[PDB]
Amino acid sequence: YIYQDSISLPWKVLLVMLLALITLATTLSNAFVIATVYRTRKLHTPANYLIASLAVTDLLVSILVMPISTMYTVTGRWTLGQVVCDFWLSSDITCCTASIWHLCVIALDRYWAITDAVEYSAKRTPKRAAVMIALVWVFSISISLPPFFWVSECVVNTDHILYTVYSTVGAFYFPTLLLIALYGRIYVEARSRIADLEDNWETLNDNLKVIEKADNAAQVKDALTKMRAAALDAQKATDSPEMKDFRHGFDILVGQIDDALKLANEGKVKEAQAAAEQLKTTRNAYIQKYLRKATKTLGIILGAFIVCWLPFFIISLVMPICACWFHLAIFDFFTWLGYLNSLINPIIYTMSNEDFKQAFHK
């Protein structure tokens, strides 16, 4: 007895489609993502090498696992024999462990970038980022070795239980306690920084009003030396070409504060007040460019990673414990929900990241 046996051939030709059309959309979405990076030298970044390295594993799953997941899922048996299904399992288990852990190494980059901006930009390289893809492809294999030691029924060793729980801890719970701890850190920095920056513009605006309606030099001085402190901070908030243009606009803002200050120090209050009038002009113009998506979008990867892989890994632990009102259709349905992760990852990075959306539309 296998449940599939009582599902007629009308539904079986509609269930060759969806799993042929899900398999295909994984190959040509993750290949459109590698060739986007392969085909751009501004996109040749240490953090866009990882996205490709990710899409690389999700491309392996789409050709090694997904088309030969279906001849088993549709019928309910296994035609291809012993020497085959030992390295069919090995791929599925590791290639989906790679897929998961690559989401950690991506979130290690974001974390160390947004937390140690200055110092880790030197360690951040291709070579240091090649170590990461590698040591996650090596550790991934080190999970599928344990069952290798120990007809028509392809499945993995559920006799040793210590393996069962180690396999689900080393490739899932660690990676989601880690994801939750990094996204925690990141969201709190990323939210403090806009607050810090909001306090900077609040100072620069509050103090301008002080100068406008000021009766003497002394208070114009203290007010201009506060905008300066504040401008010179905003300038450090967020290599060489793009950013250059952003900082230059502050180097005007600052120079106007400097020229005012001089007149304030020379005792020329009315002169300073005029000199400061130019500042509103400059504030007014860098109000558009003040008025956080990189951090919003990793909330969709966490979300679409939780929703995809949690069920399979929960249901993977109470099965060997507990049919406790359990149908092998629900263990098969949440196996495709975790394969679906290898689809959803590329399609979030086109709506999210603005360099894959300049690519696709062409």
Next chain:
Amino acid sequence: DIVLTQSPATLSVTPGDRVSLSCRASQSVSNYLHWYQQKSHESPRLLIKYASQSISGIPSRFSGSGSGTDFTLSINSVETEDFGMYFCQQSNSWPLTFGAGTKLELRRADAAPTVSIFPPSSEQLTSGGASVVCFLNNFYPKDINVKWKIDGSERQNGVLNSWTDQDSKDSTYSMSSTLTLTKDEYERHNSYTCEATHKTSTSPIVKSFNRNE
């Protein structure tokens, strides 16, 4: 960049009349808007700064109103000295931007032009060049059409027209037209005709001469 759309492009007023010049900003510029007069190329005279502030020495007949995107310069009773280009500039944000102008032109009784013709000087002829010069002077309104004829029928090529801005005092306009020929083509012909076409008259205003004199 902030676009200041001035309306209307051109405006005709009778002295006495009330006039509202409009200046519309593509986005808010708060009260950072100023108004200028420019009679010609001469450097602009600031009429009104910061929308409502009026400038020392500018006459009382000029005044400003507005905030956000809709601005109005206002001449409660336009005088004769008031022709020219009215220009709004914003200083809300960089870069400073102007409007394209409202061109303010005054009315006055009509006047057909005093038309004078002038053959070539003995001097121009002794360098083998021939220029027939026609002045049409002190007419209103400004639109006018000159046409040249050598011995009956129309000549386009070689013609050069110029025009004065509207006059300070009598509010009238003036034009020069110059037909330039080769000394040969000059004295290969006899009758030279400067036909002018103005609102003051349906059939045209025709001045002429012949070389034989």
Next chain:
Amino acid sequence: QIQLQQSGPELVKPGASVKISCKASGYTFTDFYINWMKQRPGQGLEWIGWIFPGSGNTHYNEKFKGKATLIVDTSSSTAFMQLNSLTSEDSAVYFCTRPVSYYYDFDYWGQGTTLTVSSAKTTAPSVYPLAPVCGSSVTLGCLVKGYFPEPVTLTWNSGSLSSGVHTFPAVLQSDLYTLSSSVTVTSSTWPSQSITCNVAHPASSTKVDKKIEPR
């Protein structure tokens, strides 16, 4: 007597550069922003940029970024703008101006400087007098033909007669300028008293008096 005295007009070859002047007087030159403006015959003005003389700091309109460089010589209390790699789209009028402040009763402009960007060779004008063909008023005139660059200065009887005078704008035709001027006087005054149009083209250091006399 606060004043901004800009430099004179300049013929210049396309590809070349120019320096324009703004000598400032009667206020501490170093205490106030200065702006530079461009205006072409039929059009609004555009802002090029400002400098702060006391420091030489500058902002520029993206539009004019590589074109204009504003500098300043504090010691002669003057301001310069250097335009570079010039083109036909550069012939226009250039004004420096102290901007308009909330805190000061007026603003202040230079008289303008007029750049002419061409390969055309400077040429001194021929000046033909225009007499009547042989009537309470009589109208004489004065053709000024085949010069470049602008300007010419025209007057009647070394400046004495300005009333009832119409001097028309200059007009290009294949790299030469025609200008003209009419003068209308009573039948009694001419030919009694001599009428003479005076024509200066400073680019050719050319002064030319022609006394209108009857054909």
